[PDB]
Amino acid sequence: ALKRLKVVSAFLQTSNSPKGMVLDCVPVIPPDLRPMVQLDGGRFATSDLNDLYRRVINRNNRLKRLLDLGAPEIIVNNEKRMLQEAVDALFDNGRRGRPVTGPGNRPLKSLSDMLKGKQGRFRQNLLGKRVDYSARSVIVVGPQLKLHQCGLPKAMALELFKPFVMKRLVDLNHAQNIKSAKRMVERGRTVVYDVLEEVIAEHPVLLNRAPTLHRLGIQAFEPQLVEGKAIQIHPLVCTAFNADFDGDQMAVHLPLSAEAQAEARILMLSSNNILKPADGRPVTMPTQDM
Amino acid sequence: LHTPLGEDGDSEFGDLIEDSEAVVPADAVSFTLLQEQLHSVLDTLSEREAGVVSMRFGLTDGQPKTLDEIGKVYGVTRERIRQIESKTMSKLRHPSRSQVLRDYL
Amino acid sequence: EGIINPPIDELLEATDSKYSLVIYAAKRARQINAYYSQLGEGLLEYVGPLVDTHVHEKPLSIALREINAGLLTSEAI
Amino acid sequence: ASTAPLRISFAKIKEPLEVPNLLALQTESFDWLLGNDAWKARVESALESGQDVPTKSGLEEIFEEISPIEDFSGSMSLTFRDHRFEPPKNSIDECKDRDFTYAAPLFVTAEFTNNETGEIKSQTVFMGDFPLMTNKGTFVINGTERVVVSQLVRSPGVYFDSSIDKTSDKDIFSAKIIPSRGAWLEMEIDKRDMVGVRIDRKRKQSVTVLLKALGWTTEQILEEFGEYESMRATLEKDHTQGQDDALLDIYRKLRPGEPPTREAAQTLLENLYFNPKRYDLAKVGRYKVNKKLGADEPLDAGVLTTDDVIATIKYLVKLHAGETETVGESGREIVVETDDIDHFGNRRIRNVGELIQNQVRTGLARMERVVRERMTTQDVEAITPQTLINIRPVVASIKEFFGTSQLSQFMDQNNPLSGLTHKRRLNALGPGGLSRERAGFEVRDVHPSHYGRMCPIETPEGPNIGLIGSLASYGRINPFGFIETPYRKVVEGQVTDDVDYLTADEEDRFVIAQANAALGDDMRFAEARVLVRRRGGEVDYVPGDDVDYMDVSPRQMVSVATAMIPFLEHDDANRALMGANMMRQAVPLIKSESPLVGTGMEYRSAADAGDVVKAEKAGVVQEVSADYITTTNDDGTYITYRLAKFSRSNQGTSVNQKVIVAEGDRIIEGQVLADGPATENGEMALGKNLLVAFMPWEGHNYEDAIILSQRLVQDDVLSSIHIEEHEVDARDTKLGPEEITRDIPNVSEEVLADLDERGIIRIGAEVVAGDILVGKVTPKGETELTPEERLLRAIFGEKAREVRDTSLKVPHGEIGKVIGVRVFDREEGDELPPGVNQLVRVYVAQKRKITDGDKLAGRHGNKGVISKINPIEDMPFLEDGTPVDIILNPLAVPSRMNPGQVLEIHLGWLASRGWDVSGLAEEWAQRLQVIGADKVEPGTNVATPVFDGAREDELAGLLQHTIPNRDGERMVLPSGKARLFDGRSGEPFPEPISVGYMYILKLHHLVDDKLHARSTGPYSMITQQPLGGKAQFGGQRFGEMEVWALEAYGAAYALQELLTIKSDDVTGRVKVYEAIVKGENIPEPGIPESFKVLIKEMQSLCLNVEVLSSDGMSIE
Amino acid sequence: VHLVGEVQKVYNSQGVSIHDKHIEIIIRQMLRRVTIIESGDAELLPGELVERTKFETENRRVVQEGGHPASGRPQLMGITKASLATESWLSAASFQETTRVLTDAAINAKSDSLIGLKENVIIGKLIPAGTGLSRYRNIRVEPTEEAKAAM
Amino acid sequence: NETIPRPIKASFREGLSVLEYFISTHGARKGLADTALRTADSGYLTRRLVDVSQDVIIREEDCGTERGLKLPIATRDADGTLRKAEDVETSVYARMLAEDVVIDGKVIAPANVDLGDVLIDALVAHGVEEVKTRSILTCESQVGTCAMCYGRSLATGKLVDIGEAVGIIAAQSIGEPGTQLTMRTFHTGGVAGD
Amino acid sequence: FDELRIGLATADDIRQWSHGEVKKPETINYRTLKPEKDGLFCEKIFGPTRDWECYCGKYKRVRFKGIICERCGVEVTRAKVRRERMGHIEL
RNA sequence: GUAGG
Ligand SMILES: [Mg+2]
Ligand SMILES: [Zn+2]
Ligand SMILES: [Zn+2]
Question: Per UniProt, where does Zn(2+) 2 bind (chain F)?
Fold first, then answer.
C-alpha cells in the first residue's frame, strides 16, 4: 500500500493524465540521426533503427489490410500481438524473450540501448568528448629544462598552431595571402619554422597523462621547439604524473580563449603545484638518481 | 553501422567513416577572405563599373542577371551593358588588379 | 621573457583571490586585444597599452604586467 | 656436423633426447585431417613400432559419419565412400600475389543406391575448393597468411564437485556429465539432504522419478540402494510410483501446457540422450568415462547408457557417504574423489584438424538437411548424385571459419621467433569455451600439472593474463587431444636409456625425480638424498632408490621463447616474463649478427622456423647470385631457389634474404643456404651486441631512459628498412568511369614532374608528404559554381571542367623512395572485383635509423626509450680509449630483481676477448677442461643453456685469466669493473665502473608511428565530435576522469571551451577559426550539438523533455 | 568516529596516509538523509527516505501550523543509493543506472534545476565552482584617471 | 592460498633450481592477476566516490555558529610525560580552532588560527590533552559549507578560497591510492568467514 | 536555460511534433539513389536532401528560399533542417 | 581480435 500510494500520488499531483501509459502514435527519429550514408564500391550502410521502423510499419499495414476485410478473430488477434511485439522492440530490444537478432550474429540496437551503458550517449558523448587542437607522442627526459618548460617537436608545434602561424606569416609579408600562406606552411619552408619559433612562446600548453588519477594529472607548461619527434619533460614533475619512461605517451592540449590561457597561467602552472593535496606533503621532489 | 568493427568492445563501424556535408573551416574562411578581397578590388574601380559587374555576375544574389536584365533597373541598353562589361573585364585583366586574386583562383 | 616572468604572489595580494585575479587580468587582456584588432575605427571607449610594447607580444602578458605595476583597478558592479 | 657454426657450450649434463620438430603441432594434425600419404605413412610406422595412432582420417571419418540419407520410406540411399585431391592450380607465390585463396579441389565418389529400382549409380562430384596448409603451417587466404591456434577446453565426461554452503552449515556435493555436443545433464545430492537432477536446469526434480521412468523397477532399486539411507529416504519420501506415472510427470514438467503422452515422452528421452545424433559422445568422452567411473571396456563408441547413469548415481552417493575407496560398478575397485577442473587431465586441446573437421561437419549437416528437404520434394528417377547435393553449405562454412573467427588470426612476421610463438600458442578464448568475461582467479593461475606441458612464464601481461599460453619445449599431442611429455626410465636406482611419454593423469601415479639432480660416474645416483615430486604437486624428498622416472632435460618446463634468455635461473619470474614477451617484438636490421652470449638452442629455433631457406637435396652448388642460387644433386636434379628481396611483411618490414654458401662448397641435405630476416649463418639474431657500462650520467638516463653513442647512427648498427604499400582502385560510378591519367585538373605543372604519361609515378622517384603518386580524376560532379568563382574564372579566362581530382597522395608525415608498383586492369586477363576497372598498388621504402624516442630493450626485461644521442667523444671511454656504446642506470637492477643481466655482461666481456686456461688445476679449471670450454679465441660465441648455465666461480676465474688485449694488461679488474675516464671534463672517475658486452634488440614501438597532431580535420556524422585515430587525423579524447581533474582546479572557462568550441559545436567552430586567422578575440560559445541529439532521442520514447526558462519558454 | 578510524587504519596498513577532512566529506554525505517515522501530521509517507533539509523545513512548517512534528531517525546508506536518490533527475540519469531513474522522473514530473556540476557539464555551460562563480564574473576593469593622464 | 613445507634454499645470485622456479611462478602469476583486478576495482570505486560528493562546494567565507568537534591532541602519554599522538598530522593539523584555549589563564592558540608544529608543540608542552577543533560535520551554513570550518587546503598551504571544489578533490584523494593498496590475506588459515 | 522539465507524452503532443505521417517501408530507389515519397527519408516530411534543392527540381537555387513547390511539396531550406524535423507513425 | 601503457 505504501508503494501504491507513492505511485498513485504521483499521478494525482501532476497534471499529466494516466492515459499516456498506453500510447497511440509512435514518434519517428529525424533521418540524419539514423543516416543511410553511401559507401564506395556500391555497398551501403544503415543504422538498425531503420529495420525496426520497417517492421512496425509493415505489421501495422498488414493489420490494417486484414481489418478492412472480414477476417477471423484468431488472425487479427495474432497480428495485434505481432504489432505489440514490434513496437516494444523499438523502445528496447531484448527486454523480453529473445532479442531480435536480425542478421543473426548480434542483437539489434534499439532506442533505449543508445542511452545506457559504457558506450551510451550519456557517458561517451556528453561527458567525455573528443577535441581538436591536440596531439600525442612518446616522451623522453629533459634535465636541462626548468620547472615550467617542455620541448615540443617541430611538426607537432606547427600542426597545433597552424592558424597563428598563417596569421603571423601574412603580417610579416613572407606570405602574400591566406591561401599562399597555407601553401607555404604545408610545404614547410624554413621561414615558416622561424615564424613558428617566434609565435609559440608565452603561451601555455596543458600536458596530460591517460589515467589522470588526481588533479595533478594535467599541468601547464611554456612550450619550446626541439628537433626529433619526442616530447621533452622536466624530471621533477615526472613523479607527480606517475610518468615512467619505459615507454609512455602524453596528450598536449592547447588553450585558445583569453580565459583559458589565463587560467593555465595562474592555476595550472607546473611551478605552483609543489604540494600534493592528499596529505599536504611535497610531491615534486623525486628521488631516483638525485 | 553498429557492427563490432572486428573489435569485441569500444568500437563500431559507424565511427570510422568521415562525412562530407560538414563545412571545412579552412575552406570557409578562405572563401570569406576571397569575397572580401574581391569586394575591395571591386570598390577600387569606379562605383558605376563596380555596380554593373556586380549585378551581371550576381555578387549580391545567388543567381546572375543577363545583360538586358541589367538594362531595366539601371535603364541602359543591352549593348551598352555589354560594352561596359567588356571594358571591366579588360581592366580587371590588367596585372594590377589580378595579383591579389591570382592565389584565390 | 617567460610565462612566470611576473611573480604571482604580488598579483595575488592586490586582487585578494586566485580566481578574481584570473578573471580581471583576462578582461583587461581582452580589451587590449580588441584594441589591437581595431584596425582604425577608433572607438573612444577603448584604450591602449599603458606600459611599453614589443613588436610581437600577447595581450595577456601586457595585462599581467600592468597588474604587477598596479596602474589598473577593478570594481565589482 | 656442420649443421650449425661453432659455439662453445657450458652445459654440465648431456641431454639424451633431442628436441622434436618444433612445428609438428599444426602440420601433423592437418596431415591427419587430409588423410594424405604422410598420415598413412606415420600410422603404419607407429603401428609397426607399436605406438598407438589413429587409423581413420578425419575427413573420411566425417564423410562416413554422415550415414546414407533415408526418407520416410527409406527406399534410396547415398554413400560417400572415397574422396581424393589433385595438385592445386595456383602456386603459393602466385596466390599471394593475385589475392587467391590457396586451395585444391575436393572430389568425392557418391553412389546412389535405390532398392525400388534396385540399382546403384556412381558419380564423382566436386564438393568445393578446400584451403590447404603450406609446408610452413600457414593458411594463405586472399593473399594474407592467417594461422590457426589450438584451443584448450574441458573434455567431455563425468565430473564431480564438493562445496561448502554457509547457510546449510554442511557440505553440498554435485556432479555433471558434460557431453561432446548434446545437452548437458547435472546431478546434485544433499542440496537439502536430498538428491535431484538438472535436465538442462529446466525445473526442480528428483532422481527417483527419473529412475522410475526408466525400466528399472522400484524393488531392484531398493535392493541395489539399500546400503545408503539417503536414497532410501528419497524414495520413501517419493509418493509417485510406476513407470508410466513417472514418465508423464516428467514429461508434463519438462513440456507443460499439453497432456502427457507415453510414446511422445519415450521418443523425446530417446532423442535427448539415446539418439546417436543429438548426444554423440566423442571418443575421448567415452575413453575418459570408462576410466573415471571404472567400467571395464564399455562400448568404444556410443551415447550414454542407463548402466552409466546408474554407475554415476552410485559414484555420487559413495562420495556422499564419506567412503574413499569403493568397488567399481561393473568394474574394479577405484577411488571415489572430487575432481578439480583446472587439472590438466581434464583439459584437452583441439588442434587445427579437429576444428576444421567440426566446421565442415556443421556444413555437411546443413547439406544433409537441404538434401533431405529436396528429396521430400523431389520425384523418383529424376535423381542423380550430381544434382541432389548443393556445395553452398560446405564452402560457406569453411570460408566463414577462415574469416571472422577468433581462432583464425593474422600471422605476425616481425621475425621468425614471432612466427613460431604464434604457431604454438594455445588460446582458451573461443566459441564454446572460456571467454574473456568468464575468467576467474582459479583458471588464470598456474597449476601443478602445467609442468612440461605449458610454459608458466610467457603469457600476455595485459588483461588477458593466463588465458593464452605457449606449448612446452618437449610437448607432444595425444591422439585424443591430451598433451604428453617424455620421461627417462629409472630402475633400481640407475638410469635406463628408454624414454616413455606420460600424460597428465598417468604422471600422478608414479614419483618423478629432477633432471638437475647430480648423477655420479656410474649410472646410479651420486647422492642418496635427492629431490622428487609426487601426487598433488608435493615436492617432498625421498632418499635412496625409490624413483622410477626423471625429467629428460632440465628445460622441459620452459617454452621456446623463454628458453632463449640466458642465465634464466637468476632472473625473477616477472622479468623473464617481460623479456620473453619482448623478444617477439624485435625488428630485423640491415645486417644481423649472432649473439656472443646466449643459449645454444637459437640455431634450432631458427632452422625450424620457415623464414630460412634450407636445401632439400645433398648436392653441389654451381652458380651463386643474389637473386637466385642454383644447385645440382648427384642424381641429376637441378634445383634453383628464388630468394625474396624486399617483399613487405605482414607488419610492414623487409624480408630480405642473404646468401651464405660459396660456389664450390658441398651440401648435406637440410643445410641452410640463405638467411631470412633477423638471421645469420642460420642462427637467430634479433639484435646487436653493444658495449655497455653502468653509471648515472648527468640525468639523461633518469627513470629507465637510455643514453648511447652517435656511433650507432653513424655505422647503421641499429637501422631498419620499412616498406609501406598503398593502393587505389579506378572504380566506376553512376555518372561514369574514373580515369587514372597524367592530365590532372587545377594543378601546377611542377607537381606532375615524376608522373608517367599513364599517370603512375616512376620507380625510384623520391616522394614526400603531399606528393602525387597516381593521378586519378572523378568522372564528374554536378557543379553549381558560385558568383565569386564565376567572376574569378571570367577575369582569368579559365574553364571549371566537370572532372574532379581525387588522386592518391602520400600520407602526411610519410617519406620514402618508390621501389615497386603493380597494376591490374579489368579488360586484361586479370580479374578484379566487380565494378573496379583498374587497381594500382605502390610501394615506398625508407631506411629508419635509430633516433631519439625509439624504444630499446634487452633480454632480461630491461626496456627504455632513448633519451639522448651524445657525440662519440662525450662517452666515458675506457682506459685504452674505446668508448662505451650505451649507458644504463644501475638503480634499476636491485629494485627490479633481475641480477642475471649483470652476470651476462661479465660473460659477454669474456666472450669478446678469449680465455686461456690450461693446467691451472682449480675446480672451475677442471670443470672447464672436462666440458671442453678451456681454450677460446676472441670473438667466438659461447653457449650457456637455460638451467645448465655457468656459475659465478667460473666467471670470476675467467676474469682473473682473460687474455691480454694490448700492452699485456687486463682492462677489467678481477671484481669485474674497469676504470673509466670522463669524456667531457677529462678527469678519471673516482672508482672503477662495471663494463662489458650486452645483446640489445630494437622493439617495434618506434616514435615515427606514434606521433600525431591535429589543427582541424574530419568530423563524425551522427554527432559532429571529431572522429579519433591517427589514420584519419583524430583528436585526443578528453575523458570523464580528465574533466574531473580540470574541475578540481576550479577552472570553468577552460572546460567550457574544451566542451563547446573545440568540438561538438559546428556553428562556433568556423567562427573561432575565422577569429584566430583574422586576429580578433574568440567569440561566445553557444549550446553544443550532442545535447540536441540526446533530447531528440529522448523525445522519441514518448517523453516531452521541454527546455523551459524561469520566465516561461527559453531562448535557444 | 568509528567509520573514519576504520577506513584510516585500513589505509595506513601499507603506509598511505590521507587527511580526515577528505573522509569526513563523504561520511557527512552518507547521513544527510533521514528515515521519517510516524508521518502523521507531516502528511507525507512514513518510513521513506527524506533529505535532512526538507525534513527540517517540513518540521518548522508543521509546528508553525500548530500540528506536531513527524518523527525521524538517522539512517546510514551507501554511496550508491545516495547518488541515485538525488533530487536532480538529469544527474541521476548520467550515473550508471538510467532506465529506472528516467522512468520514475517521467512519471513524477520532476523539473531539474541546473544547480550542480554534472548537470552543467553536459549542457556546455560554466560549472559554478571557482572562476565560473557569479561574484567572480561581473567586474569591470578600468585604468585609473592618473594612468590615462600619464600616457 | 596455501604454504609449502620446503622453502627455497637459494638466492637469485646463487641461482634457483627448477621446481623452486616453478613454485615461485605460482605466486608471481597470482600477483600479476591481482594487479589487473585491483585497477578495475579501484577505478570503479573512484568513480562512485566523485558522483556522491560532487555537490558540496565552499560557498561562504565564514560560518554563523560555534559548535565544534573534540579531538585528542596527545595520546599514549607515558608516565610523567606528555607524548603527541603518532598520527596527529592526519587528524588535527590544518583544522581550525573554533573556541579559544586557556590552560594557565592566558590564550595560547588564538581562535581561527591553524595548527602547525609550533602551536601544537606549545599546547602539548603546556599539557593539554584534548581540543575542540572546528570541522565540516558540525558546520552550519545555509549554502553548502563555509571555508572557515573546512580549514586550510593542502595543495596551497593557505586557507581555501571560496567556491573551490572540495568534493571532487576529496574523492580523487580517496581513490588515488586504491591501486596502491594491493594487499590480501596471505593465507586463509583453513577457515572461511573468520 | 533554467530547467529541463520531463513528463508523460500524450498522443496530442506526438501529433504536434510530427511534420507529416509515414505510410510505407520504402527508403530510396534502387536505380536513382534518391529518397522515395511518403516513406522514410521522405523530403516532403523531413526536408530536402541537398541545400535548397527541391525533389522535382522546380527550385534549385539559393535565392528563392522559404517557398514550397507545388510539384513535390518540398520546402527549400538548408539540408540541416532534416537533422531536426520529425514525423510520426499512426497505429 | 592482438600488442604496448
Ligand atoms: Mg608507464
Ligand atoms: Zn562553517
Ligand atoms: Zn519540387
Answer: 63, 139, 146, 149
Measured distance CA(B8)–CA(B12) in Å, rounded:
10
Q: Identify how the structure was determined.
A: cryo-EM
Q: Which ligand is nearest to the CA of A248?
A: 1
- Does any strand H atom come closer than 7 Å to the Cβ of D409? yes
Helix (H, G, I), strand (E, B) or coil at D804: strand
Q: Which one-letter DSSP state was computed for residue D946?
A: S
Please report the DSSP string for A45-96 in residue order. ---THHHHHHHHHHHHHHHHHHHHS---HHHHHHHHHHHHHHHHHHH-TTSS
Pairwise CA distance, residues D864 & D1000, whole Å? 11
Domain tally for chain C? 1
What residue numbers bound the domain in which C26 lies? 1-77
Task: Note whether D890 and A288 are within 8 A (CB).
Answer: no
Q: Which of residues 11-70 of F touch A (CB under 8 A)?
A: 46
- D90 Cβ nearer than 7 Å to chain H strand: no
Residue E94 near residue A123 (C-beta atoms within 8 A): yes
CA-wise closest residue to D231 among D261, D201, D206, D251: D206
Classify residue B92 as exposed, middle or buried by CB count within 10 Å of its CB (0-12, 13-18, 19+). buried
Of A206, A266, E131, A262, nearest to C8 by C-alpha is A266
Kind of pairing between the strands at D144-148 and E112-113 = unpaired
- In E, minimum Cα distance to D1063 occurs at E124
Helical residues (DSSP H) of D961-1089, grouped into ranges: 1007-1010, 1040-1048, 1053-1056, 1066-1078
Name the DSSP class of D993.
E
Q: Which residue of A has its CA nearest to E110?
A: A14
Residues in chain F: 194
- Looking at the DSSP bridge assignments, the partners of residue D477 are D483
Using CA atoms, how far residue G89 sits from A40, A109, D684, D920, D1102, in Å, is 33, 20, 69, 100, 13
Of A204, A251, A257, the closest CA to residue D1061 belongs to: A257
Cα distance between residue D513 and residue D530, in whole Å: 8
The distance from CA D261 to its chain's CA centroid, rounded to whole angstroms, is 53
Q: How far is the CA of F152 from the centre of ligand 2 (A)?
A: 13
Contact D335/A at CB under 8 A? no
User: Which residues on chain C are in Cβ contact (under 8 Å) with A258?
Assistant: 26, 29-30, 33, 59-60
Positive or negative CA dihedral for D886, D891, D897, D903? positive
Chain D: list its partners (3+ Cβ pairs within 8 Å): A, B, C, E, F, G
Spatial contact of D396 and D363, defined as CB atoms under 8 Å apart: yes
- Rounded Cα–Cα distance for residues F41 and F39 (Å): 5
Please give the sequence-ordered ranges of beta strands (E in DSSP) within D524-669, or none if there are none.
549-550, 613-614, 619-624, 628-633, 638-642
- Residue A211's nearest nucleotide, by CA–C1', is H5
Domain range for D265 is 154-350
Residues 379-408 of D with CB under 7 A from strand H: 406
Residue D791, class by beta-carbon neighbours within 10 Å (0-12 exposed, 13-18 middle, 19+ buried)?
buried
For residue A243, which nucleotide's C1' is closest to its Cα?
A: H5
Torsion of CA D848, D850, D853, D857, to 10 degrees: 120
Q: Give the angle F14-F15-F19 at the CA atoms, nearest 5°.
A: 140
Distance F57 CA to H2 C1' (A): 45
Contact G75, G47 (CB under 8 A): yes
Q: Which triple of cell numbers denotes residue G82?
A: 532534416
Tell if the CB–CB gap between A213 and F175 is shorter than 8 Å: yes
Per-residue b or e along A256-273, where b marks 16 or more CB atoms closer than 10 Å to that residue's CB: bbbbbbbbbbbbbbbbbb
Taking Cα atoms as reference points, which of F114, F65, F54, F108 lies closest to residue F89?
F114
Distance CA D1076, CA D1055 (A): 19
Q: Are A206 and A218 in contact (CB under 8 A)?
A: yes
